[PDB]
Amino acid sequence: ATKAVAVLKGDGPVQGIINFEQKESNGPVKVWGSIKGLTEGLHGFHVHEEEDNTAGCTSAGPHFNPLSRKHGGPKDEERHVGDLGNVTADKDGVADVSIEDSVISLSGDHSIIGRTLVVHEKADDLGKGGNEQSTKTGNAGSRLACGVIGIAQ
Ligand SMILES: [Cl-]
Ligand SMILES: [Cl-]
Ligand SMILES: [Cu+2]
Ligand SMILES: [Zn+2]
Secondary structure, X not given: OEEEEEEEEOOOOOEEEEEEEEOOOOOOEEEEEXXXXXXXXXXXXXXXXXXXXXXXXXXXXXXXXXXXXXXXXXXXXXXXXXXXXXXXXXXXXXXXXXEEEOOOOXXXXXXXXXXXEEEEOOOOOOOOOOOOOHHHHOOOOOEEEEEEEEEOO
């Protein structure tokens, strides 16, 4: 099995430790953890393209999209590799992550290891919104916290 961790931080109170595990090189990836410091409600949660050693969430980039597809929710056939949907924060600002995904991988040509995990200010509209930007970013707005997805040490 391969394991990774992303430590989310930003310029504000949003932070958390996100774990990844992939038991087989072409098997599902499981993702879990908690994020604190969020406003109550849905927040977009994606793997972004950025893999340079830029300062925090200044150049997270577009979504990680090695197959040059349109934005969707995680269950949509047409989606970015990085499209992990939304997390939901409660009234005290904590969102629990619990995702099983078939599209991301920790291995091979399109590994997400080294890419940037991002949690957003607003909800992801899952590509179902009324503008072209829905089909790019889901209109999830600003990056509140980000971290490099690194192999577990
Ligand atoms: Cl925003
Ligand atoms: Cl803004
Ligand atoms: Cu994102
Ligand atoms: Zn996307």
